[PDB]
Amino acid sequence: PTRFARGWHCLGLLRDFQDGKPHSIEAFGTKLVVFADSKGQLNVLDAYCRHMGGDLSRGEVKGDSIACPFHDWRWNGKGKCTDIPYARRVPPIAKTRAWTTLERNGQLYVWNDPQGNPPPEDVTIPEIAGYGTDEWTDWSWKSLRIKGSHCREIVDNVVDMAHFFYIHYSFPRYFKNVFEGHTATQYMHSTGREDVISGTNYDDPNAELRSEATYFGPSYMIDWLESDANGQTIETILINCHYPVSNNEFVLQYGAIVKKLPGVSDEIAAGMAEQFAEGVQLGFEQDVEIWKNKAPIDNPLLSEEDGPVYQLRRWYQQFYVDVEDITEDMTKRFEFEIDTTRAVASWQKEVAENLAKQAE
Amino acid sequence: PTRFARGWHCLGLLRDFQDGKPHSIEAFGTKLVVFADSKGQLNVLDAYCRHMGGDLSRGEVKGDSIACPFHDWRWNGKGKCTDIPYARRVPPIAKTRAWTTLERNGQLYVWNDPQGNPPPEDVTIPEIAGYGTDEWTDWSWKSLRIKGSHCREIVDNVVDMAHFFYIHYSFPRYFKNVFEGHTATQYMHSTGREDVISGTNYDDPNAELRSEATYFGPSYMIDWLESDANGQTIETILINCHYPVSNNEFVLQYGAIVKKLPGVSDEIAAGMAEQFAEGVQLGFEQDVEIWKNKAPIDNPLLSEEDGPVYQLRRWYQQFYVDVEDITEDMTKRFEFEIDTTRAVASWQKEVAENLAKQAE
Amino acid sequence: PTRFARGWHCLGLLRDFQDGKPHSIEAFGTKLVVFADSKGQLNVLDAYCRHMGGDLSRGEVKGDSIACPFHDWRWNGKGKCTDIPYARRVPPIAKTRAWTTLERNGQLYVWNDPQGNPPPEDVTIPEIAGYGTDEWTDWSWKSLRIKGSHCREIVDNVVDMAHFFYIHYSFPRYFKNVFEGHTATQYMHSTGREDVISGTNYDDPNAELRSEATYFGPSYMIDWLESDANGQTIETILINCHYPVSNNEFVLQYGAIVKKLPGVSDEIAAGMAEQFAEGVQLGFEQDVEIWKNKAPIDNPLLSEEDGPVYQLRRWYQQFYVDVEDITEDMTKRFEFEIDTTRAVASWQKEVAENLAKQAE
Numbered sequence A, B, C: 001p002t003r004f005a006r007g008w009h010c011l012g013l014l015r016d017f018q019d020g021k022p023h024s025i026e027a028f029g030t031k032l033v034v035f036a037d038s039k040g041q042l043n044v045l046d047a048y049c050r051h052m053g054g055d056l057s058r059g060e061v062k063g064d065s066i067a068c069p070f071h072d073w074r075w076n077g078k079g080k081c082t083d084i085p086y087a088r089r090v091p092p093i094a095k096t097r098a099w100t101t102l103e104r105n106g107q108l109y110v111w112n113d114p115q116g117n118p119p120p121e122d123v124t125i126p127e128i129a130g131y132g133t134d135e136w137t138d139w140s141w142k143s144l145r146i147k148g149s150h151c152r153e154i155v156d157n158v159v160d161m162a163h164f165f166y167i168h169y170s171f172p173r174y175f176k177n178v179f180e181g182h183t184a185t186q187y188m189h190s191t192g193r194e195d196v197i198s199g200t201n202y203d204d205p206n207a208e209l210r211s212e213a214t215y216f217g218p219s220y221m222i223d224w225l226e227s228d229a230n231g232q233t234i235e236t237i238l239i240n241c242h243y244p245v246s247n248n249e250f251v252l253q254y255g256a257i258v259k260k261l262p263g264v265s266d267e268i269a270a271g272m273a274e275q276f277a278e279g280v281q282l283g284f285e286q287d288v289e290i291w292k293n294k295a296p297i298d299n300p301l302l303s304e305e306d307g308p309v310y311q312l313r314r315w316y317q318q319f320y321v322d323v324e325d326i327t328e329d330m331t332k333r334f335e336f337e338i339d340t341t342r343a344v345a346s347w348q349k350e351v352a353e354n355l356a357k358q359a360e
């Protein structure tokens, strides 16, 4: 009916699944069950039992298999029926759909592919250096649902230079995109507007914000943020990721970790990190207010100061065709820098005009 | 997909739009923004910005243009992009859909037409003599949504003689329809039932109610009501109008103004007018109870005492075909009078039977 | 669009319809009105009036006809317009859809058939011996709606031997199905599990439960239950029935009557019957928890201990084809006994293992 993106998708944080009860996720137009085996590893299958349609997510784990609450059949992490407890044997074709998993960076990922193939080794989610380490906090994480929109409308932001001023209240002084293979990257530097105070990580006019944000596949973005304040620089890592529930609904997730400042107690270091982590969340929530309130546009009208929207969408298209049909122009290295001079000039004028009105 | 009526449609009262923030209206299967320019005149455009789909209704007005809250592009009342503030020029094709407006009788109207043409001069909404005048009150106005029905099911009432007895508790003693060009008219006179007391303008058995109600196009009806009580006659004007939200939902609006009785103080004159205005609203709300609870019928079964339903629907059909395809039988003057003698005889009998039971 | 089962369907208890106002039932993809005539007999018609679509369920009864609340036309139990009170005659084709009724066992049934034929005499609902009698209680009855599922998913339970252990906490020691003509029967005997206490009629490990449950057509099941406790045996009768609201929603109803134990006062006999009646309801509510939480399966994966699912569905299919197309294999007597030995052996082991853990 409706085609979902081939790639890694994060279903949430490991710590929310290791408990070791089963969990339901509505995703990819169906329902999924997540459960830990006896060795604590996570498994993902279609939630609905292939016997008579019982809900495996409402079952319990027994050994290394999930047990259906209707007639107690047992399904393992590869989708195989390991036992029908009241029958001599298992019909030889007792198999359901199993999703390949990846546990990394304190998160759970599943591989989706309509063609039914496994993830190739060169398509993965990178290890975030610093995670699982006293130096860095643990994820502050949040989640919501957006309806009436596509996943792609989030991805469109990769190339959106102008919204940094209007939505994040900052001047994007450097802005560059690089699309290559199965990744899409935004590099940008900003300083905060003097005519606005809102407690985000974009706020400070005295600090330069340096951002490198990359989609590792269609659904998962890691944004490395450095805020140079005084001599010292605050390092954070923001995750922006999504997965489709249906053709018309998706889950959007975002989380932050902050690097602890050294030569200070834990009480104070962990308290200030949390303080900055909230600022990052608030920045992200500025995008959310737009994303919850906007129509899709297949044929956007573009200005000379727009980022490379059509090339971004071309790159993204690779994840919605069969791998044999992916073309060179989708995956070949493409880069584009916007000279932000004109925009910043317009913006600095406007901000000066505001500041003049603020006093007199 | 689904075709909406060509014609003037009232979106509400001017005073609710002159404030001068933007307003959203869900109508004609899309979302609209209404906003005042610097000279206070109202403008209507599609709400969704043609750049990347931001919601203009959630923006602000700047001069004579609405400003998108996503990247601040500026759109004027003719749908032209007047400025991209951070870019040198406006792409030469920067245009969105603009709706032609009419401000009159303290209300805002928009012209809808699938063929995309402007309103011809001979198709308009007449000036209501008496509006904007100390002699007459201002609109008491109300609004609601009806789902699971068509606009046409409201229009069907033009020819419904019998419902005056069952729904408005009155005897329709005179009843006539005239359809002509783009108007459809109901003339009727009534007196109230003695066996029922409910505080509507149809209630009084001693007063004769005279009504002339005309659809000026497919969506907007003005009903001139005169209630002859004693020597003196109370004059009111009721509006019944609608506009479609989707193929399956519409907004129904109704409002009243009353002429102030002279030779009395303002406190008392304005207080009694309001008193009568409520009676009119209550009468209208009797129709609403039916309209919220009734199925559409494409092939109604008709009695010898029904009004000219098929001719009414034929007239109405003109608004759902292209102007080149409108036929003579749709627009040619048609009139039909129901002789209400038989019905009134049946009704007066039944009412007498009730009154006999009331006492003994 | 979507085809509903030909057969008797119970709309509820007679006592809820004899009052003698009209009642609406949403069923078979439309709305229905139920009303008592002057002799107290019940009538069922489409709710929407064939004049202009008024809601007959919101009308009142006048003599032997329901009166539309919009223009007061009168419709009798055979769907004929008996009067247009304000008109000389009734158009000669004034007919709406009438549903054939059956009042029996304190319940109201309607005959549905897409082919528009009347119920044949040999297809009926049997008189429940004991109903309407001091010896037996009156129906304790309950009702709910299930969405996202088909009627058939309830019917699938006829052949579900295994769920008695997992869902009703009992050992099915005897289990047999017989399908024949337009009936489908489940015979089973059980004893309760010692490792579980929940206050249902399946609970007692010391009592043998004997059940004979038969679908008399596609929608209505009567289950004769005998619980042999001590010397004395408790007799109950459970009804499980349904009717479709739409293709995607249905109403599920269940009720119980209990036979009063003799040689005891009424206060105590009626109090204990009610006590047992609740136990029966709780048992049924165990199925409801599964039925509210399960996906349809067109191609169920079956074990060697499954009941004859495909033959059951073949039998059921007769009610969704035209009577001329019903085949011998649908209606020919078919019987199947499951030898429950292996399952009970597995189950008794598992239960012993639990009991061992319970103590130590």
Ligand code: FES
Residues within 6 Å of the ligand: A049, A050, A051, A052, A053, A054, A055, A068, A069, A070, A071, A072, A073
């Ligand atoms: S439905 Fe899952 S075991 Fe029967």
Ligand code: FES
Residues within 6 Å of the ligand: B049, B050, B051, B052, B053, B054, B055, B068, B069, B070, B071, B072, B073
């Ligand atoms: S979406 Fe309207 S200005 Fe960019």
Ligand code: FES
Residues within 6 Å of the ligand: C049, C050, C051, C052, C053, C054, C055, C068, C069, C070, C071, C072, C073
């Ligand atoms: S709609 Fe039923 S009588 Fe007119």
Ligand SMILES: [Fe+2]
Residues within 6 Å of the ligand: A157, A163, A167, A168, A287
């Ligand atoms: Fe952003």
Ligand SMILES: [Fe+2]
Residues within 6 Å of the ligand: B157, B163, B167, B168, B287
């Ligand atoms: Fe009316």
Ligand SMILES: [Fe+2]
Residues within 6 Å of the ligand: C157, C163, C167, C168, C287
């Ligand atoms: Fe059951």
